[PDB]
Amino acid sequence: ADWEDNMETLNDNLKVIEKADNAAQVKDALTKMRAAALDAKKATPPKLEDKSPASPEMIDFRVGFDILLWQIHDALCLANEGKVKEAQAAAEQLKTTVNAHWQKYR
Amino acid sequence: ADWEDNMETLNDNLKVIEKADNAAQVKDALTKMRAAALDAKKATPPKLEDKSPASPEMIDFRVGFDILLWQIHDALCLANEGKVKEAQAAAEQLKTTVNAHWQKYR
Amino acid sequence: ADWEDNMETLNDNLKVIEKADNAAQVKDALTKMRAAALDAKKATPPKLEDKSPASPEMIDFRVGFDILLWQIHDALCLANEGKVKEAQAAAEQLKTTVNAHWQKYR
Ligand SMILES: [Ca+2]
Ligand SMILES: [Ca+2]
Ligand SMILES: [Ca+2]
Ligand SMILES: [Cl-]
Ligand SMILES: [Cl-]
Ligand SMILES: [Cl-]
Ligand SMILES: [Cl-]
Ligand SMILES: [Cl-]
Ligand SMILES: [Cl-]
Ligand SMILES: [Co+2]
Ligand SMILES: [Co+2]
Ligand code: NA
């Protein structure tokens, strides 16, 4: 998928997590976010379409999605332990990272 | 160890998992798989030897190994929770991903 | 931060972990290590300033931080489960890897 569509997926699953009722729902949403973030790693965002795929700017873009993947895992590890409210709180940090990525690269 | 030797290591530990009984065996084979996948991520596979190191194809190859690493992680998580049968089923699907990447880039 | 400052951050937190009393301290130090490893993926060791950003040597450099990040993941999952002595044992393995990567690229 396109970068913008992956970003839509990330925001939508953040909403799902915010209203989630159990650990399975959180796990499922975070899995979909992980797939969207790994897919966005292969994309080029609008701001960087005038940069080469291995420019320092594009390497930093990909590393920013690595950062997001490890934050997704923090929430996911909490959810795997059945600690649903803790995982939702952790998803708050994901909102910050996603919004900052949106604003930096759109 | 080059890329093809790492793919062989991955397949060997997949067999080890499929015949394992206790969770420490599965976990040990999965940890060896993680190391092999990380070593393969920094290789150039035979199909892409004529491509620029800065090519989109090489970036896609490396992100594909990140995808494999998170699938390995999911299996490893199931094995850490003592869910031997579930981890072995997860590794059965890993056979597909690993051998798909193998045939794709050999 | 540049590469050597990030490696210093890794080493500082490995010492904090060695001399830690509870799991919260281990978790805090490990989260800092993760942030430094990720940030170092965007850095360039002085002796590689001339190579391409996607040169095989720079790929090697970045994937070496992925290797560290998965070791940190193991230690941090152990610390989140209260397995403090086990987390510290894993961090002692981390020390070896950090020093090897330092020797490789400095
Ligand atoms: Ca759209
Ligand atoms: Ca372009
Ligand atoms: Ca290295
Ligand atoms: Cl939409
Ligand atoms: Cl990268
Ligand atoms: Cl990459
Ligand atoms: Cl140089
Ligand atoms: Cl790259
Ligand atoms: Cl890379
Ligand atoms: Co890269
Ligand atoms: Co995990
Ligand atoms: Na030089």
mmCIF file of C-alpha atoms and ligand atoms in Angstrom:
data_model
loop_
_atom_site.group_PDB
_atom_site.id
_atom_site.type_symbol
_atom_site.label_atom_id
_atom_site.label_comp_id
_atom_site.label_asym_id
_atom_site.label_seq_id
_atom_site.Cartn_x
_atom_site.Cartn_y
_atom_site.Cartn_z
ATOM 1 C CA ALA A 1 0.000 0.000 0.000
ATOM 2 C CA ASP A 2 0.837 3.687 -0.389
ATOM 3 C CA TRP A 3 2.349 5.573 2.535
ATOM 4 C CA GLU A 4 -0.777 7.678 3.006
ATOM 5 C CA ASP A 5 -3.006 4.561 3.084
ATOM 6 C CA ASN A 6 -0.734 2.870 5.645
ATOM 7 C CA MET A 7 -0.969 6.008 7.784
ATOM 8 C CA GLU A 8 -4.757 5.758 7.576
ATOM 9 C CA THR A 9 -4.489 2.146 8.787
ATOM 10 C CA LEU A 10 -2.300 3.239 11.724
ATOM 11 C CA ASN A 11 -4.723 5.976 12.824
ATOM 12 C CA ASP A 12 -7.769 3.708 12.451
ATOM 13 C CA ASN A 13 -6.270 0.947 14.581
ATOM 14 C CA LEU A 14 -5.231 3.520 17.185
ATOM 15 C CA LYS A 15 -8.914 4.398 17.511
ATOM 16 C CA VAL A 16 -9.801 0.686 17.736
ATOM 17 C CA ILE A 17 -7.292 0.203 20.557
ATOM 18 C CA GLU A 18 -8.581 3.246 22.427
ATOM 19 C CA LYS A 19 -12.080 1.744 22.573
ATOM 20 C CA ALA A 20 -10.988 -1.921 22.874
ATOM 21 C CA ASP A 21 -12.712 -4.232 25.351
ATOM 22 C CA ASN A 22 -10.306 -7.165 25.631
ATOM 23 C CA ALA A 23 -6.754 -8.317 24.983
ATOM 24 C CA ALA A 24 -7.615 -10.067 21.717
ATOM 25 C CA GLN A 25 -9.003 -6.861 20.187
ATOM 26 C CA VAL A 26 -5.890 -4.919 21.199
ATOM 27 C CA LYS A 27 -3.604 -7.682 19.857
ATOM 28 C CA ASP A 28 -5.446 -7.757 16.519
ATOM 29 C CA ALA A 29 -5.292 -3.975 16.090
ATOM 30 C CA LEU A 30 -1.584 -3.851 16.972
ATOM 31 C CA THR A 31 -0.865 -6.674 14.522
ATOM 32 C CA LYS A 32 -2.555 -4.686 11.759
ATOM 33 C CA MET A 33 -0.515 -1.618 12.798
ATOM 34 C CA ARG A 34 2.700 -3.650 12.654
ATOM 35 C CA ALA A 35 1.891 -4.866 9.137
ATOM 36 C CA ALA A 36 1.068 -1.305 8.050
ATOM 37 C CA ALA A 37 4.310 0.066 9.524
ATOM 38 C CA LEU A 38 6.442 -2.641 7.870
ATOM 39 C CA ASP A 39 4.691 -1.921 4.580
ATOM 40 C CA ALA A 40 5.247 1.831 4.942
ATOM 41 C CA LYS A 41 8.962 1.089 5.348
ATOM 42 C CA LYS A 42 8.963 0.191 1.637
ATOM 43 C CA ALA A 43 7.165 3.400 0.639
ATOM 44 C CA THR A 44 8.317 6.928 -0.113
ATOM 45 C CA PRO A 45 6.393 9.703 1.697
ATOM 46 C CA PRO A 46 5.268 12.865 -0.152
ATOM 47 C CA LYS A 47 7.930 15.110 1.395
ATOM 48 C CA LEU A 48 10.744 12.774 0.269
ATOM 49 C CA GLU A 49 9.634 12.048 -3.302
ATOM 50 C CA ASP A 50 12.500 14.325 -4.429
ATOM 51 C CA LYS A 51 15.048 12.156 -2.556
ATOM 52 C CA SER A 52 16.754 8.925 -3.567
ATOM 53 C CA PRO A 53 15.728 5.647 -1.847
ATOM 54 C CA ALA A 54 19.079 5.413 -0.021
ATOM 55 C CA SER A 55 19.448 9.106 0.802
ATOM 56 C CA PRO A 56 20.117 9.867 4.497
ATOM 57 C CA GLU A 57 16.602 11.343 4.647
ATOM 58 C CA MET A 58 15.030 8.080 3.454
ATOM 59 C CA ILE A 59 17.181 6.015 5.814
ATOM 60 C CA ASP A 60 15.986 8.210 8.692
ATOM 61 C CA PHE A 61 12.389 7.771 7.457
ATOM 62 C CA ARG A 62 12.750 3.981 7.551
ATOM 63 C CA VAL A 63 14.417 4.089 10.982
ATOM 64 C CA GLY A 64 11.457 6.147 12.237
ATOM 65 C CA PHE A 65 9.205 3.269 11.255
ATOM 66 C CA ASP A 66 11.572 0.910 13.114
ATOM 67 C CA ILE A 67 11.034 3.106 16.177
ATOM 68 C CA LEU A 68 7.277 2.859 15.682
ATOM 69 C CA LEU A 69 7.549 -0.947 15.348
ATOM 70 C CA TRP A 70 9.313 -1.253 18.699
ATOM 71 C CA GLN A 71 6.693 0.977 20.377
ATOM 72 C CA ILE A 72 3.960 -1.222 18.855
ATOM 73 C CA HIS A 73 5.757 -4.179 20.410
ATOM 74 C CA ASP A 74 5.703 -2.533 23.862
ATOM 75 C CA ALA A 75 1.915 -2.345 23.652
ATOM 76 C CA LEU A 76 1.788 -5.869 22.189
ATOM 77 C CA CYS A 77 3.861 -7.362 25.006
ATOM 78 C CA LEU A 78 1.529 -5.739 27.515
ATOM 79 C CA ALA A 79 -1.482 -7.205 25.680
ATOM 80 C CA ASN A 80 0.063 -10.694 25.552
ATOM 81 C CA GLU A 81 0.257 -10.601 29.356
ATOM 82 C CA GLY A 82 -3.461 -9.766 29.497
ATOM 83 C CA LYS A 83 -2.704 -6.236 30.802
ATOM 84 C CA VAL A 84 -5.252 -4.490 28.615
ATOM 85 C CA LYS A 85 -5.403 -1.054 30.269
ATOM 86 C CA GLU A 86 -1.608 -0.861 30.347
ATOM 87 C CA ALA A 87 -1.477 -1.694 26.637
ATOM 88 C CA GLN A 88 -4.028 1.028 25.878
ATOM 89 C CA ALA A 89 -1.974 3.563 27.845
ATOM 90 C CA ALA A 90 1.055 2.405 25.814
ATOM 91 C CA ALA A 91 -0.963 3.027 22.644
ATOM 92 C CA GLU A 92 -1.063 6.671 23.720
ATOM 93 C CA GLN A 93 2.672 6.918 22.910
ATOM 94 C CA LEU A 94 1.909 5.389 19.496
ATOM 95 C CA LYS A 95 -0.509 8.232 18.765
ATOM 96 C CA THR A 96 2.277 10.766 19.379
ATOM 97 C CA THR A 97 4.733 8.951 17.101
ATOM 98 C CA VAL A 98 2.142 8.436 14.353
ATOM 99 C CA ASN A 99 1.003 12.085 14.431
ATOM 100 C CA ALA A 100 4.606 13.343 14.386
ATOM 101 C CA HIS A 101 5.396 11.079 11.432
ATOM 102 C CA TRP A 102 2.283 12.327 9.603
ATOM 103 C CA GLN A 103 3.246 15.940 10.134
ATOM 104 C CA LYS A 104 6.926 15.469 9.256
ATOM 105 C CA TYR A 105 6.514 13.498 6.018
ATOM 106 C CA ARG A 106 3.197 14.457 4.387
ATOM 107 C CA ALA B 1 27.924 -17.917 6.008
ATOM 108 C CA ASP B 2 26.401 -16.293 2.929
ATOM 109 C CA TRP B 3 22.722 -15.694 2.180
ATOM 110 C CA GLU B 4 22.095 -19.217 0.890
ATOM 111 C CA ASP B 5 23.732 -20.779 3.954
ATOM 112 C CA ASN B 6 21.494 -18.660 6.190
ATOM 113 C CA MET B 7 18.426 -19.863 4.281
ATOM 114 C CA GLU B 8 19.621 -23.435 4.885
ATOM 115 C CA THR B 9 20.009 -22.686 8.607
ATOM 116 C CA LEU B 10 16.451 -21.332 8.651
ATOM 117 C CA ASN B 11 15.065 -24.474 6.994
ATOM 118 C CA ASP B 12 17.022 -26.786 9.286
ATOM 119 C CA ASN B 13 15.688 -25.186 12.432
ATOM 120 C CA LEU B 14 12.174 -25.274 10.944
ATOM 121 C CA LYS B 15 12.509 -29.048 10.777
ATOM 122 C CA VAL B 16 13.901 -29.087 14.342
ATOM 123 C CA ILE B 17 10.832 -27.152 15.532
ATOM 124 C CA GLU B 18 8.413 -29.411 13.675
ATOM 125 C CA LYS B 19 9.821 -32.471 15.470
ATOM 126 C CA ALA B 20 10.252 -30.860 18.918
ATOM 127 C CA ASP B 21 8.361 -31.701 22.122
ATOM 128 C CA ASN B 22 9.113 -29.138 24.868
ATOM 129 C CA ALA B 23 9.116 -25.347 24.735
ATOM 130 C CA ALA B 24 12.857 -24.928 25.333
ATOM 131 C CA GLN B 25 13.603 -26.928 22.170
ATOM 132 C CA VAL B 26 11.295 -24.794 20.009
ATOM 133 C CA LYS B 27 12.671 -21.655 21.655
ATOM 134 C CA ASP B 28 16.288 -22.650 20.948
ATOM 135 C CA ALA B 29 15.568 -23.408 17.281
ATOM 136 C CA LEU B 30 13.699 -20.091 16.956
ATOM 137 C CA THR B 31 16.612 -18.144 18.432
ATOM 138 C CA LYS B 32 18.985 -19.730 15.904
ATOM 139 C CA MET B 33 16.494 -18.780 13.167
ATOM 140 C CA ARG B 34 16.454 -15.146 14.360
ATOM 141 C CA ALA B 35 20.255 -15.007 14.161
ATOM 142 C CA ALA B 36 20.236 -16.547 10.657
ATOM 143 C CA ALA B 37 17.600 -14.064 9.444
ATOM 144 C CA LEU B 38 19.597 -11.117 10.824
ATOM 145 C CA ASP B 39 22.749 -12.393 9.104
ATOM 146 C CA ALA B 40 20.841 -12.812 5.834
ATOM 147 C CA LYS B 41 19.381 -9.287 6.025
ATOM 148 C CA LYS B 42 22.848 -7.795 5.453
ATOM 149 C CA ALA B 43 23.623 -10.021 2.453
ATOM 150 C CA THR B 44 23.045 -9.484 -1.237
ATOM 151 C CA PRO B 45 21.016 -12.384 -2.634
ATOM 152 C CA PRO B 46 22.081 -13.923 -5.973
ATOM 153 C CA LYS B 47 19.153 -12.557 -7.960
ATOM 154 C CA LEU B 48 20.054 -8.977 -6.953
ATOM 155 C CA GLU B 49 23.854 -9.153 -7.353
ATOM 156 C CA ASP B 50 23.712 -7.001 -10.526
ATOM 157 C CA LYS B 51 21.610 -4.278 -8.872
ATOM 158 C CA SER B 52 22.868 -1.137 -7.184
ATOM 159 C CA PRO B 53 23.287 -1.427 -3.403
ATOM 160 C CA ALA B 54 21.095 1.706 -3.359
ATOM 161 C CA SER B 55 18.297 0.038 -5.341
ATOM 162 C CA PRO B 56 14.665 -0.158 -4.182
ATOM 163 C CA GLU B 57 14.931 -3.918 -4.706
ATOM 164 C CA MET B 58 17.593 -4.216 -1.990
ATOM 165 C CA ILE B 59 15.507 -2.108 0.398
ATOM 166 C CA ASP B 60 12.486 -4.345 -0.278
ATOM 167 C CA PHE B 61 14.664 -7.425 0.349
ATOM 168 C CA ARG B 62 15.774 -6.055 3.733
ATOM 169 C CA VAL B 63 12.259 -5.074 4.848
ATOM 170 C CA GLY B 64 11.140 -8.582 3.883
ATOM 171 C CA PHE B 65 13.600 -9.897 6.425
ATOM 172 C CA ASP B 66 12.143 -7.527 9.038
ATOM 173 C CA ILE B 67 8.754 -9.083 8.272
ATOM 174 C CA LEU B 68 10.221 -12.554 8.755
ATOM 175 C CA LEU B 69 11.834 -11.435 12.037
ATOM 176 C CA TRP B 70 8.480 -10.370 13.437
ATOM 177 C CA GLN B 71 6.898 -13.674 12.385
ATOM 178 C CA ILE B 72 9.746 -15.472 14.188
ATOM 179 C CA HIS B 73 9.062 -13.240 17.193
ATOM 180 C CA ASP B 74 5.371 -14.228 17.253
ATOM 181 C CA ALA B 75 6.284 -17.902 17.265
ATOM 182 C CA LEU B 76 8.893 -17.249 19.957
ATOM 183 C CA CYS B 77 6.260 -15.509 22.086
ATOM 184 C CA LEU B 78 3.953 -18.528 21.831
ATOM 185 C CA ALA B 79 6.900 -20.744 22.827
ATOM 186 C CA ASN B 80 7.697 -18.502 25.824
ATOM 187 C CA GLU B 81 4.114 -18.947 27.060
ATOM 188 C CA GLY B 82 4.603 -22.733 26.973
ATOM 189 C CA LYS B 83 2.244 -23.095 23.980
ATOM 190 C CA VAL B 84 4.301 -25.733 22.172
ATOM 191 C CA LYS B 85 1.645 -26.912 19.694
ATOM 192 C CA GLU B 86 0.694 -23.328 18.795
ATOM 193 C CA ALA B 87 4.325 -22.324 18.275
ATOM 194 C CA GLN B 88 4.840 -25.370 16.052
ATOM 195 C CA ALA B 89 1.833 -24.401 13.933
ATOM 196 C CA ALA B 90 3.189 -20.844 13.680
ATOM 197 C CA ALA B 91 6.509 -22.294 12.492
ATOM 198 C CA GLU B 92 4.669 -24.345 9.855
ATOM 199 C CA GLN B 93 3.620 -21.046 8.281
ATOM 200 C CA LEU B 94 7.200 -19.813 8.699
ATOM 201 C CA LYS B 95 8.182 -22.625 6.316
ATOM 202 C CA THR B 96 6.136 -20.849 3.654
ATOM 203 C CA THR B 97 7.574 -17.380 4.321
ATOM 204 C CA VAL B 98 11.186 -18.608 4.537
ATOM 205 C CA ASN B 99 11.014 -20.751 1.417
ATOM 206 C CA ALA B 100 9.101 -18.039 -0.446
ATOM 207 C CA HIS B 101 11.915 -15.593 0.263
ATOM 208 C CA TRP B 102 14.419 -18.315 -0.664
ATOM 209 C CA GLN B 103 12.914 -19.053 -4.070
ATOM 210 C CA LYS B 104 12.153 -15.375 -4.723
ATOM 211 C CA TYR B 105 15.783 -14.237 -4.476
ATOM 212 C CA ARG B 106 17.888 -17.285 -5.329
ATOM 213 C CA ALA C 1 23.300 11.802 18.840
ATOM 214 C CA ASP C 2 26.334 10.681 16.823
ATOM 215 C CA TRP C 3 27.571 7.092 16.868
ATOM 216 C CA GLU C 4 30.083 7.280 19.721
ATOM 217 C CA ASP C 5 27.674 9.191 21.995
ATOM 218 C CA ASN C 6 25.014 6.546 21.344
ATOM 219 C CA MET C 7 27.508 3.762 22.150
ATOM 220 C CA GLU C 8 28.392 5.617 25.338
ATOM 221 C CA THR C 9 24.692 5.740 26.203
ATOM 222 C CA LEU C 10 24.477 1.968 25.652
ATOM 223 C CA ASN C 11 27.491 1.385 27.931
ATOM 224 C CA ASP C 12 26.234 3.725 30.667
ATOM 225 C CA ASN C 13 22.976 1.843 30.801
ATOM 226 C CA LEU C 14 24.660 -1.567 30.795
ATOM 227 C CA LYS C 15 26.486 -0.415 33.945
ATOM 228 C CA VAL C 16 23.216 0.870 35.451
ATOM 229 C CA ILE C 17 21.727 -2.582 34.789
ATOM 230 C CA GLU C 18 24.703 -4.404 36.333
ATOM 231 C CA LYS C 19 24.251 -2.357 39.531
ATOM 232 C CA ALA C 20 20.439 -2.492 39.629
ATOM 233 C CA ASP C 21 18.224 -3.438 42.584
ATOM 234 C CA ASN C 22 14.713 -3.802 41.108
ATOM 235 C CA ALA C 23 13.010 -4.399 37.765
ATOM 236 C CA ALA C 24 11.923 -0.783 37.212
ATOM 237 C CA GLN C 25 15.563 0.343 37.016
ATOM 238 C CA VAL C 26 16.447 -2.472 34.598
ATOM 239 C CA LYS C 27 13.440 -1.597 32.423
ATOM 240 C CA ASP C 28 14.324 2.110 32.361
ATOM 241 C CA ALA C 29 17.949 1.423 31.414
ATOM 242 C CA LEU C 30 16.893 -1.072 28.713
ATOM 243 C CA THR C 31 14.397 1.398 27.213
ATOM 244 C CA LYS C 32 17.180 3.976 26.987
ATOM 245 C CA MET C 33 19.427 1.375 25.309
ATOM 246 C CA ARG C 34 16.726 0.652 22.739
ATOM 247 C CA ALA C 35 16.364 4.358 21.931
ATOM 248 C CA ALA C 36 20.152 4.711 21.515
ATOM 249 C CA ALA C 37 20.452 1.660 19.230
ATOM 250 C CA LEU C 38 17.643 2.931 17.037
ATOM 251 C CA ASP C 39 19.131 6.418 16.915
ATOM 252 C CA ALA C 40 22.563 5.000 16.063
ATOM 253 C CA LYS C 41 21.060 3.340 12.982
ATOM 254 C CA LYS C 42 20.878 6.906 11.622
ATOM 255 C CA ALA C 43 24.516 7.643 12.458
ATOM 256 C CA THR C 44 27.730 7.037 10.532
ATOM 257 C CA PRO C 45 30.999 5.916 12.123
ATOM 258 C CA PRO C 46 33.826 8.317 11.245
ATOM 259 C CA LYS C 47 35.728 5.717 9.215
ATOM 260 C CA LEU C 48 32.685 5.052 6.985
ATOM 261 C CA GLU C 49 31.947 8.718 6.139
ATOM 262 C CA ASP C 50 33.247 8.129 2.590
ATOM 263 C CA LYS C 51 31.150 5.071 1.727
ATOM 264 C CA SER C 52 27.672 5.122 0.210
ATOM 265 C CA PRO C 53 24.831 5.336 2.777
ATOM 266 C CA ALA C 54 23.610 1.977 1.407
ATOM 267 C CA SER C 55 27.082 0.504 0.847
ATOM 268 C CA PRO C 56 27.369 -3.093 2.108
ATOM 269 C CA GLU C 57 29.495 -1.841 4.987
ATOM 270 C CA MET C 58 26.794 0.657 6.031
ATOM 271 C CA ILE C 59 24.131 -2.059 5.722
ATOM 272 C CA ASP C 60 26.321 -4.202 7.975
ATOM 273 C CA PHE C 61 26.531 -1.285 10.446
ATOM 274 C CA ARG C 62 22.755 -0.748 10.614
ATOM 275 C CA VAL C 63 21.891 -4.454 10.842
ATOM 276 C CA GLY C 64 24.381 -4.755 13.700
ATOM 277 C CA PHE C 65 22.122 -2.403 15.589
ATOM 278 C CA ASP C 66 19.157 -4.627 14.684
ATOM 279 C CA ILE C 67 21.049 -7.541 16.272
ATOM 280 C CA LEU C 68 21.472 -5.426 19.407
ATOM 281 C CA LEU C 69 17.797 -4.415 19.371
ATOM 282 C CA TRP C 70 16.625 -8.047 19.392
ATOM 283 C CA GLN C 71 18.973 -8.846 22.298
ATOM 284 C CA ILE C 72 17.577 -5.791 24.126
ATOM 285 C CA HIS C 73 14.081 -7.103 23.383
ATOM 286 C CA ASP C 74 14.887 -10.398 25.106
ATOM 287 C CA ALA C 75 16.314 -8.597 28.152
ATOM 288 C CA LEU C 76 13.360 -6.202 28.351
ATOM 289 C CA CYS C 77 10.741 -8.953 28.056
ATOM 290 C CA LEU C 78 12.546 -10.711 30.925
ATOM 291 C CA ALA C 79 12.575 -7.520 33.008
ATOM 292 C CA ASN C 80 8.857 -6.934 32.349
ATOM 293 C CA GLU C 81 8.191 -10.423 33.778
ATOM 294 C CA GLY C 82 10.214 -9.729 36.939
ATOM 295 C CA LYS C 83 13.064 -11.990 35.763
ATOM 296 C CA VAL C 84 15.672 -9.490 36.943
ATOM 297 C CA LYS C 85 18.653 -11.817 37.385
ATOM 298 C CA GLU C 86 17.818 -13.311 33.983
ATOM 299 C CA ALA C 87 17.575 -9.837 32.433
ATOM 300 C CA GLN C 88 20.964 -8.897 33.904
ATOM 301 C CA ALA C 89 22.458 -12.134 32.601
ATOM 302 C CA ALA C 90 21.159 -11.200 29.148
ATOM 303 C CA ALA C 91 22.602 -7.692 29.499
ATOM 304 C CA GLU C 92 26.003 -9.218 30.232
ATOM 305 C CA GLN C 93 25.758 -10.904 26.838
ATOM 306 C CA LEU C 94 24.755 -7.502 25.429
ATOM 307 C CA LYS C 95 27.998 -5.990 26.719
ATOM 308 C CA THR C 96 29.991 -8.479 24.632
ATOM 309 C CA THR C 97 28.072 -7.612 21.472
ATOM 310 C CA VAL C 98 28.275 -3.843 22.007
ATOM 311 C CA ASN C 99 32.040 -4.072 22.499
ATOM 312 C CA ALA C 100 32.433 -6.235 19.392
ATOM 313 C CA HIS C 101 30.483 -3.715 17.305
ATOM 314 C CA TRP C 102 32.536 -0.871 18.784
ATOM 315 C CA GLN C 103 35.795 -2.612 17.872
ATOM 316 C CA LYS C 104 34.496 -3.384 14.378
ATOM 317 C CA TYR C 105 33.720 0.176 13.287
ATOM 318 C CA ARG C 106 35.819 2.548 15.426
HETATM 319 CA CA CA D 1 -6.451 6.934 0.909
HETATM 320 CA CA CA D 2 10.794 9.766 -6.378
HETATM 321 CA CA CA D 3 27.998 -4.794 13.710
HETATM 322 CL CL CL D 4 -9.749 5.922 5.280
HETATM 323 CL CL CL D 5 17.222 1.934 6.645
HETATM 324 CL CL CL D 6 16.432 -1.077 4.379
HETATM 325 CL CL CL D 7 36.560 7.325 5.574
HETATM 326 CL CL CL D 8 19.019 1.229 3.542
HETATM 327 CL CL CL D 9 19.599 -1.153 6.459
HETATM 328 CO CO CO D 10 18.078 0.209 5.285
HETATM 329 CO CO CO D 11 8.225 -9.541 22.150
HETATM 330 NA NA NA D 12 38.607 7.117 3.612
#
